[PDB]
Write a protein that binds this ligand. Sequence first.
Ligand SMILES: *[C@@H]1O[C@H](CO)[C@@H](O)[C@H](O)[C@H]1NC(C)=O
Length: 106
Amino acid sequence: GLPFGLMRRELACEGYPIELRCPGSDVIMVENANYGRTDDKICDADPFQMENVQCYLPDAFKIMSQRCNNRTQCVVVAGSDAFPDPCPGTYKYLEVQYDCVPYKVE
Ligand SMILES: *[C@@H]1O[C@H](CO)[C@@H](O)[C@H](O)[C@H]1NC(C)=O
């Protein structure tokens, strides 16, 4: 509860599962998301794996959208066979931005 007033967003360290939940009877609506690494300050791991801060995966968006779209809550593995590999040997992550809208009207 208590919206952020600036879209909802969840991020999870590669290899661990991520959780999305919408308030009341709203449903998750994935707007944008990416699987990879664009920062070295998230999910502190070995420096060698955190050196590359430039890894993107567009399809990451479609995967989460299909999995969380129109759902009140959804859980996905921020790694494993649930996400390809846009940059091996690096500690990745998953960032998903979405909004919660009513499952019907009002
Ligand atoms: C969610 O529901 C709306 C209305 O029924 C539909 O247009 C939309 O396509 C659904 N989400 C997805 C991913 O299809």
